[PDB]
Amino acid sequence: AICSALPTIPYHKLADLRYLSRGASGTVSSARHADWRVQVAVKHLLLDSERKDVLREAEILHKARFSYILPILGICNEPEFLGIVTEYMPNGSLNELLHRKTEYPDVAWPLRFRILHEIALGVNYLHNMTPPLLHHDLKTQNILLDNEFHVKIADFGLSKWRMMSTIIYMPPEKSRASIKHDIYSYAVITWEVLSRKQPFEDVTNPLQIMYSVSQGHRPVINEESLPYDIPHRARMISLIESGWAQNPDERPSFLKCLIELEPVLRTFEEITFLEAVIQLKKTKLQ
Amino acid sequence: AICSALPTIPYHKLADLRYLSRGASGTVSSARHADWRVQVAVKHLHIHTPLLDSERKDVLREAEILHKARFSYILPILGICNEPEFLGIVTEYMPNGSLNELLHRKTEYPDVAWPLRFRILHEIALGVNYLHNMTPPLLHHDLKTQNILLDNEFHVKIADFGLSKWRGTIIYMPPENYEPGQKKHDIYSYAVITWEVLSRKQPFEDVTNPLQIMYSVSQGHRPVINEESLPYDIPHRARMISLIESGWAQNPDERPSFLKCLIELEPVLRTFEEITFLEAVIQLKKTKLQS
Numbered sequence: 129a130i131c132s133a134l135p136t137i138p139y140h141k142l143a144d145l146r147y148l149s150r151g152a153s154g155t156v157s158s159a160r161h162a163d164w165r166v167q168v169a170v171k172h173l174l175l176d177s178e179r180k181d182v183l184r185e186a187e188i189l190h191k192a193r194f195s196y197i198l199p200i201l202g203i204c205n206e207p208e209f210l211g212i213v214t215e216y217m218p219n220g221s222l223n224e225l226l227h228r229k230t231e232y233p234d235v236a237w238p239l240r241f242r243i244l245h246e247i248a249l250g251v252n253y254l255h256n257m258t259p260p261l262l263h264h265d266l267k268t269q270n271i272l273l274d275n276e277f278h279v280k281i282a283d284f285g286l287s288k289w290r291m292m293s294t295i296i297y298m299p300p301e302k303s304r305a306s307i308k309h310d311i312y313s314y315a316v317i318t319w320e321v322l323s324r325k326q327p328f329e330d331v332t333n334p335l336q337i338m339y340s341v342s343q344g345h346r347p348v349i350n351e352e353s354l355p356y357d358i359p360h361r362a363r364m365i366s367l368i369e370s371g372w373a374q375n376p377d378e379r380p381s382f383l384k385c386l387i388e389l390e391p392v393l394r395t396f397e398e399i400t401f402l403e404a405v406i407q408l409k410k411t412k413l414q
Numbered sequence: 415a416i417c418s419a420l421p422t423i424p425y426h427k428l429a430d431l432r433y434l435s436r437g438a439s440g441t442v443s444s445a446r447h448a449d450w451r452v453q454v455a456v457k458h459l460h461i462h463t464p465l466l467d468s469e470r471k472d473v474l475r476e477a478e479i480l481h482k483a484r485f486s487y488i489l490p491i492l493g494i495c496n497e498p499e500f501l502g503i504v505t506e507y508m509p510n511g512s513l514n515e516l517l518h519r520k521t522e523y524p525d526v527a528w529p530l531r532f533r534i535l536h537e538i539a540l541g542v543n544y545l546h547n548m549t550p551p552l553l554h555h556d557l558k559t560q561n562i563l564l565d566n567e568f569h570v571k572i573a574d575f576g577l578s579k580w581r582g583t584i585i586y587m588p589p590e591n592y593e594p595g596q597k598k599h600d601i602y603s604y605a606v607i608t609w610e611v612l613s614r615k616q617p618f619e620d621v622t623n624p625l626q627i628m629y630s631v632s633q634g635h636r637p638v639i640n641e642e643s644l645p646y647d648i649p650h651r652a653r654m655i656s657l658i659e660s661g662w663a664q665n666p667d668e669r670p671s672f673l674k675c676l677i678e679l680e681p682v683l684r685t686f687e688e689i690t691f692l693e694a695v696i697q698l699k700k701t702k703l704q705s
């Protein structure tokens with residue numbers, strides 16, 4: 129009954145456009161809104177089909193608003209520019225946090241587990257929509273972190289509306305159920321977050337990754353990839369291994385993951401998150 | 415062109431309903447969404463007497479307003495509860511209450527670091543300015559320290575839309591609204607809120623009768639500005655006092671736009687380092703415990 133139109137942001141109101149990153153789908157730049165006095169991020173690419181792609185992603189973000197989804201502030205739809213405008217995330221992506229070990233020599237476990245929990249919450253919300261929305265392109269580069277390192281899921285270019293129950297996060301290719309797609313990616317992201325290593329480190333051609341996963345093989349789980357000092361390491365490993373099970377029916381729902389995670393996160397006090405973020409921003413200086 | 419329908423939340427999925435507050439505009443309770451696994455706040459009317467279609471229209475108007483005014487510093491609405499046996503607006507849960515509690519519960523919050531105060535002021539200005547930039551422009555007309563919620567890291571979220579339902583809070587009403595001849599409202603409220611945040615005092619503290627407060631304000635009087643209410647060791651004290659006194663000018667035409675206030679506030683907030691904010695918030699959260 130209650131319907132909301134996505135605001136149309138005039139391009140001329142976006143000032144100080146500066147390149148932040150160039151990806152497969154577009155270019156993300158920071159900017160300042162002249163009227164609202166806030167900083168925004170602009171993702172821009174035109175063939176009418178790709179214009180439809182951009183508009184489709186904008187509408188999906190608009191309908192999928194939630195606490196852990198990148199909040200879209202508007203769409204810029206002009207003759208000379210087509211871009212999605214979202215909140216600006218000063219702390220980049222989960223990828224940077226996990227792998228730039230000079231910037232972030234230490235990332236305290238409480239922060240990692242809160243990130244994992246919030247990814248699970250956001251994706252569960254998506255899967256609980258009507259109809260359920262399947263993200264199908266989760267990766268540590270899609271997960272942005274706001275000023276206090278809370279998750280914002282992004283990149284909804286590869287998405288579907290029909291659930292029932294780069295490629296390093298893609299499940300292997302019988303009767304096929306693509307409801308269990310996101311959970312495989314989440315398993316890989318979990319292994320990544322807990323290991324701070326690149327999945328399939330020794331692989332030089334991504335097709336090697338496809339062949340290995342199709343053969344039932346996954347990122348290595350041993351003391352080197354996952355030290356034994358990981359909180360709830362056994363439960364987390366079980367979560368991971370069920371998440372990337374070769375059979376999609378063996379993979380849990382995101383609700384099961386939240387059920388399985390709640391005690392794990394409960395082991396940490398809420399203040400430790402803030403402490404870890406302050407340690408992060410202090411050691412990143414100097 | 416791009417339209418989003420506000421979700422309809424089944425009442426039965428709101429669990430552990432716990433009364434948080436009973437107010438002039440409604441009743442706020444905390445609850446937990448069985449599917450989303452998150453805590454939410456539900457604003458609902460009295461449960462006994464059937465809701466008159468005017469109250470139902472008010473609730474729908476508030477829900478749609480929150481939905482259309484979505485923004486970084488506005489209370490995020492997650493859905494509407496529209497059932498035979500319950501009608502409530504569902505929003506994100508703000509664990510840290512309102513700006514009023516932060517400013518005046520000095521045992522919980524003995525000290526509130528200046529960077530945090532100025533960030534709060536800036537974010538309030540941002541939220542109300544966004545509100546004013548909508549089409550049609552939305553005038554809040556009921557800004558107060560009770561409407562300003564603080565999320566888990568003490569970032570501002572403006573709340574309380576729709577109307578009021580009665581069937582202390584006049585310190586933020588300008589003197590030309592006392593008798594509403596239905597004719598630049600919010601900025602006065604913002605000036606008063608600023609004076610409060612920098613002073614951490616009750617405006618018109620020595621006045622026990624609000625009717626006397628209204629008389630004074632109609633006479634051009636405002637909260638006292640001296641060394642006792644605003645010590646001279648306050649950062650950017652002069653600039654902030656000028657902003658205040660211009661905001662609550664007797665003449666509404668003399669009060670500045672929220673855009674002017676944002677232009678003036680931008681350098682002030684610019685003097686603070688990003689780590690000082692995090693440190694202020696964590697210091698706050700730590701002294702709030704063990705107290």
Ligand SMILES: COc1cc(NS(C)(=O)=O)cc(-c2cc(-c3ccc(N4CCNCC4)cc3)cnc2N)c1
Pocket residue numbers: 148149151156168169170171198212213214215216217218219220221224269270272282283284
């Ligand atoms: C819809 O438009 C998007 C999409 C996506 N996600 S995506 C990969 O395209 O699917 C992200 C953003 C976004 C990025 C950033 C951001 C902040 C810092 C950086 N860094 C670059 C190098 N390291 C230092 C800083 C990069 C990006 C901040 N806010 C944002 N809303 C905007």
Ligand SMILES: COc1cc(NS(C)(=O)=O)cc(-c2cc(-c3ccc(N4CCNCC4)cc3)cnc2N)c1
Pocket residue numbers: 434435437439440442455456457489503504505506507508509510511512560561563573574575
């Ligand atoms: C849309 O529904 C609303 C409206 C409004 N604003 S309003 C005046 O009603 O228009 C606020 C909230 C809300 C309140 C709270 C909250 C939590 C605890 C407390 N308490 C602390 C202990 N002492 C007693 C008060 C008070 C409020 C936490 N989240 C929230 N979203 C929800």
